[PDB]
Design an enzyme around this catalytic site. Sequence first.
Site, mmCIF file in Angstrom:
data_model
loop_
_atom_site.group_PDB
_atom_site.id
_atom_site.type_symbol
_atom_site.label_atom_id
_atom_site.label_comp_id
_atom_site.label_asym_id
_atom_site.label_seq_id
_atom_site.Cartn_x
_atom_site.Cartn_y
_atom_site.Cartn_z
ATOM 1 N N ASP D 72 0.776 -1.245 0.000
ATOM 2 C CA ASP D 72 0.000 0.000 0.000
ATOM 3 C C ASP D 72 0.806 1.293 0.000
ATOM 4 O OD1 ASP D 72 0.888 -0.485 2.700
ATOM 5 O OD2 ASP D 72 -1.051 -1.406 3.117
ATOM 6 N N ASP D 141 -7.987 -6.846 14.228
ATOM 7 C CA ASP D 141 -9.276 -7.475 13.927
ATOM 8 C C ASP D 141 -9.120 -8.493 12.811
ATOM 9 O OD1 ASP D 141 -8.703 -5.794 11.776
ATOM 10 O OD2 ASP D 141 -10.536 -4.665 11.901
ATOM 11 N N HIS D 143 -7.713 -8.051 9.827
ATOM 12 C CA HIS D 143 -7.701 -7.574 8.439
ATOM 13 C C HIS D 143 -6.296 -7.523 7.846
ATOM 14 C CE1 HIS D 143 -6.668 -3.445 9.849
ATOM 15 N NE2 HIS D 143 -6.019 -3.471 8.699
ATOM 16 N N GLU D 148 -10.879 -3.888 4.507
ATOM 17 C CA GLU D 148 -11.762 -3.931 5.657
ATOM 18 C C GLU D 148 -12.199 -5.356 5.990
ATOM 19 O OE1 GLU D 148 -11.043 -0.599 5.963
ATOM 20 O OE2 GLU D 148 -12.925 0.369 5.310
#
Lengths: 266, 266, 266, 266, 266, 266
Positions: D72, D141, D143, D148
């Site tokens: 990214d 979480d 990811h 997401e």
Amino acid sequence: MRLIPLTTAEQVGKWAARHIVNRINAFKPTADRPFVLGLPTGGTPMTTYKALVEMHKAGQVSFKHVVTFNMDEYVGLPKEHPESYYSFMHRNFFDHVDIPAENINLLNGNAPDIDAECRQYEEKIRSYGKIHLFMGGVGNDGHIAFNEPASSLASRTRIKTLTHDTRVANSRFFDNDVNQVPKYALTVGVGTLLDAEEVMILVLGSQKALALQAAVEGCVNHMWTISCLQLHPKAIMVCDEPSTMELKVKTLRYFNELEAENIKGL
Amino acid sequence: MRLIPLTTAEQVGKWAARHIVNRINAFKPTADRPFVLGLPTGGTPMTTYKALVEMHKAGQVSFKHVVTFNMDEYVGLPKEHPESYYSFMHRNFFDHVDIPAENINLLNGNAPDIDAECRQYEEKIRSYGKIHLFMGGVGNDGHIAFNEPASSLASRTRIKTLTHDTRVANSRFFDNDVNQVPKYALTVGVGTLLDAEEVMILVLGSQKALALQAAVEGCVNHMWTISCLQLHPKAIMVCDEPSTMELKVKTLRYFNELEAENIKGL
Amino acid sequence: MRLIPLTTAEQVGKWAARHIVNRINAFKPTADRPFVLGLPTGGTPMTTYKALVEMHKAGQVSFKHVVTFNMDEYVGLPKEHPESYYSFMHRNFFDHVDIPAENINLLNGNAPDIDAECRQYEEKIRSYGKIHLFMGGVGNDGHIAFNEPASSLASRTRIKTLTHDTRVANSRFFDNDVNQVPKYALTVGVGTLLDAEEVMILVLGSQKALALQAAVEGCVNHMWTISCLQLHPKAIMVCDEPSTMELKVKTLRYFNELEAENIKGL
Amino acid sequence: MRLIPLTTAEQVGKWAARHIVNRINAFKPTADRPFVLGLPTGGTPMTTYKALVEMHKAGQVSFKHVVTFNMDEYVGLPKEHPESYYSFMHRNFFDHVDIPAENINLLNGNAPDIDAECRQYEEKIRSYGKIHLFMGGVGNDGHIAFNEPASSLASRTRIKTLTHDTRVANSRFFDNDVNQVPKYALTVGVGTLLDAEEVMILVLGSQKALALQAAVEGCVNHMWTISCLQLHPKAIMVCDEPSTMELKVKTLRYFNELEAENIKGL
Amino acid sequence: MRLIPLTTAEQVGKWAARHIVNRINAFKPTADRPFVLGLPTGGTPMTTYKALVEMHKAGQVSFKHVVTFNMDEYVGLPKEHPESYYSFMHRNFFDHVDIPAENINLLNGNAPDIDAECRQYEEKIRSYGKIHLFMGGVGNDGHIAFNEPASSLASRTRIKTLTHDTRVANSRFFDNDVNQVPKYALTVGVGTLLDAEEVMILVLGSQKALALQAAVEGCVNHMWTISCLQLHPKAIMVCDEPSTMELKVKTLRYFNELEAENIKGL
Amino acid sequence: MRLIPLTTAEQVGKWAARHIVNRINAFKPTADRPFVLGLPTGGTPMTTYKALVEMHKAGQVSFKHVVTFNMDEYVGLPKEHPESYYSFMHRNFFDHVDIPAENINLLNGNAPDIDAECRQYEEKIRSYGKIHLFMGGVGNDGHIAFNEPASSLASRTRIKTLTHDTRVANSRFFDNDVNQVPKYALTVGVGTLLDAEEVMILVLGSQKALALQAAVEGCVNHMWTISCLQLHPKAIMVCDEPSTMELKVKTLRYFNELEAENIKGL
């Protein structure tokens, strides 16, 4: 077990204050038969203390015949030190109400003999018979006061060694340094709290969503002390919106319906 | 509930023996006020009995004023038969300590009237008031003594029909044949055990990992009797390393920290 | 907790009736020491009432010295109205047995002062000391009588506002219209029921499979009230085949073995 | 799925670096057949980059024929800005190795047409055929990159609107202010990552204990993206001690035994 | 996924044998287009081999054009040694049917180069295209053949170091001594098995009840390899009564209804 | 997987219709390259069909170049019978739009050879290549169309014997009698549906709350077919408020935030 689902901390404080006032007023306490109240310190009860003071000032209640017992206090800290629980209670509540000094009970963090201090605190409570309403908060892991998880349901007032979690959690009041915050604290036990006639827990913030879930939807288990309140004859949880994140939509809808008639004026 | 995480059976036995000794010594028993101890048989308590005998021989304790009650006994088996619980107890403990014959209580597997035997056993206990410390083991399915899973938390001493699981499990002591092992056993109930002031369960071996998990991490439920100890005022689990296989790493790390100061000398 | 796994409603009724009869007959009640029985209405107990009446008519029991207390009644409904619980009880049981009118206790749905009615009902029970055997059914969500889920384990007799679920559920007896069925009902509390010496719950139909599972296999939690019976000293669940759908094969096999000797004559 | 249980971040970095080096060296890349490596930024890969650089400097690997693709980059941020992923990669890795500028692929956070940028990034990858080894981290979480939770397993490179969680999480690099941190980021999709021949996830810290548990012990479900790696032909998780807090003792013992021969030199 | 709930091992073997026969007969194999069958060894398939042989002898099938591939074999064990998988297969199946030696494929536990052996085994399979029906058993922890739990779903034929669990589990065939049983085994991978057109798993005994539950009721997860069969286009589980102990009554009732028309002749 | 949380069935229908229209319009279908749509019957899609017709009438879409394939049809029922799926589709959709008869595909419940009918239906689909968007509903137990739970993810169009659940569920359209409703139905398989490029499931009503939960929060498992959509490249669930009862408050809050920009105009 009742769950009062509200939106804001402000509403929680108002609902709680109103509940304490109605309980006292219906009790009609006297010098010979006072209303005994258990109380906590910290940010959680702040809006409740504010609301209580206003009701008193509005002439709705009098603490002339109310005896109070606080949940805990820091060991080896001058009562005068602003961050002691002694200072918190006076500054936030006692300085604004009509309660006699003889009616206030706080654990002496500076007792010469700590074990005698705890023992006498329990005897003091039994003197009056029982606490009519004990208000408290809940830890992120479901623990009560300074009692650790897996603590006995019959534990009594005693000294506890604070956890680094708590130290840093509490370090901000002490400048923001961790070695300033005390190492020991005196705390009522889970047994002391359960002996109360009515127990009301204030749950504010999403960091308490897991504890709320364990208490309302989960099963009875000693790791989440808060869940044992399911076996209590008269327990109430009062919460704000962020704390409901882990509940099922239907659970929240159920309690909203069940308590719909009891949540307006806030 | 306390969990004492240790490594070996040997350490478990030493920790347990030391706990029993300190309890007796702090109690200061006399002929008029004896210390009542509940005890089990089998391989589980072996290292504890060995450690107790050594402490006694080292002059650290005296069982002169200790009354004991055993959990169970085989029905219709001569006391003299080596594999009776009577023989186990004498050979492994009583033959090496100073306990009076009048202070030893064992269920008579050969009582003429079995129901009267059980009834009187309970009356005998109530005579002394209560058992101060009841030590026991736990089954692979979480059951206590010979009480079946889903047994009432108020069950009392009674006769039970043994399960083939247990028969074969116990067949080795009887040559290795299953029809040699008795069909009935007398056992104290879950109520008898819970009435004790303090309960200490010895958990050894990986075959008990599921029972340990249900007791420490699980929720309260009657299928795993052991889990109901979460509601007991003073329960302690002492375990070896293999029995912790089903616990979360953090659970084991928590109890190790909490009891770190209490696990050295072993 | 005992679970009696049977096949049909007819067998459930026969097993239950026989259990009540043996309990009475072993008790040997007299005018001074009557046997107190708690009872429910509705379709669930139908086969039990039928079986009880036959046993009475066969000369096996006499209700001459049996005092009964019913769980609930509709508020503001003429005793004479066929669908009142008063009419149900007489038509289905009292009209066929030898019980004195003085021995029958039913909540007066038309009491002038409702709170006094509930208060006196509790006092009436305490008068006799305790209920020896309370029989009841269970809701699909595990609730008892008209007590809501999450109700306190110490709740007492009181008035409750019926839920649309129940209204429509009950609308058929009232032609099939929902606004005909009452809005309020008087009901004994979970505390009243738990104080009974023995509690026997009749579970019939697959719609109760989840409630049966929560009671037998699940953990203790206040959302499924029925599960709290795990903490009761003497509770029994009697069920038909369709209600076992959610249990594990081994659970059902376990109880069948354990109660095999107790399920024939039906 | 392999799990490499190590103690420190330092060891994780060494194990990972060594794995990348052996993979390259066994591949024997050339100008016509380069080894394609997928890479992440942030604190997680820091010890791995340090270890890689040392091995290169020790003469153990050469990145002359290695093509890299980063996961990214921040949208609308000057490549030159120290906190861009471009600067991170050069400062922490590229400035110290022999990789040709033509072999480096990074998403242009300042592309005139963002969708064309993402589309071409995917085409660029397909040009080489496939990524041989994609290294990445995992969110609290579960990811991956900026995808997401509940994201499609076939998602591709695209622009994503950052979450306040991430903004504040990342605010420190930007003085400590939240409105300084970009609002958009370009990220490879879960599909891009899964197409890699081998996927190696670095898990450091207790805040990732839940994600580690969902990946190793949990079941396959789209809410914890990381768990879908269970369906990947060749996935490896490398972790430090604090991240194992939620695993069962036996799970950790299993992988330690299974990989015991593969964890020394660190 | 189909589940065929039967009562005995004998019925399982008959149902399975009949399924293999119908599959072959409907396929109409020839020398140019043979029917490829994957097979296991051990006690589990015993009743199936017995039933297959009888059907062949009854003139119902011919293995003249059936090619077989076995799941595994012990490393460094003489083919001639009675306990090799080679001896098991001949003694239990091949010695009684008309299959050409050229049609039998077994991993050479004594190949000079083990990796070449595994590689060629896979090539051999691809030669024929695909396995039409792969029959196998399941471990107590849900693993397939000698593949460990958490093994990749794309794993291929390879050598594996046996686990002491397996060694002792298998020690009985080797007198009853553990150091006699080999240390290594060659095994097909989970990928090899999943590539089969149809997969049929034989589940016998209560020790496999947990594996059956994970496969039928549980969710897809790599720790219980067997559960990944839920993603297979054509998988069948055939089981006896003892293996269903952990399933819900309704699950077992569902499959019995669904396959009722397919379980008679056994 | 996307979840579009809406309030009413009316909004669900509008959101869905709008999604189908935008998909078609962006596709720009022609006679040579039509847009293939999969469709269901029943009450669930009613509001979507209504909304589609209005958009068409408002001049927003044209079905001139749209080919449709329906999920199922009753076996042995005259096309002309009002309750056939043929009549439902024409009366509710086709009678109001510009779709050519040649573009409509429906399973012939009265095909002379049923297996040829199913086979050809699949070939017909492959003719066009693939279904671009398949819309469907979900059963209370998570099943798709008439496919049973535990059905293979690769199942194809076939005949299925209807379940009494469905018969009575569907009996109302047939006066209200159960023996009027057909015994067999033709249905596309789970494989047929998964091959679609995009899958959009309409979830309406609280009776589907458990299915919604299994699909969004649960893990991938073949018993709740709907959950396998988690592995689909492009799946969307559109739901009303009553169907969200079993989701966690945070799950619902997450999707509301994520799709907030996509839910207005309804």
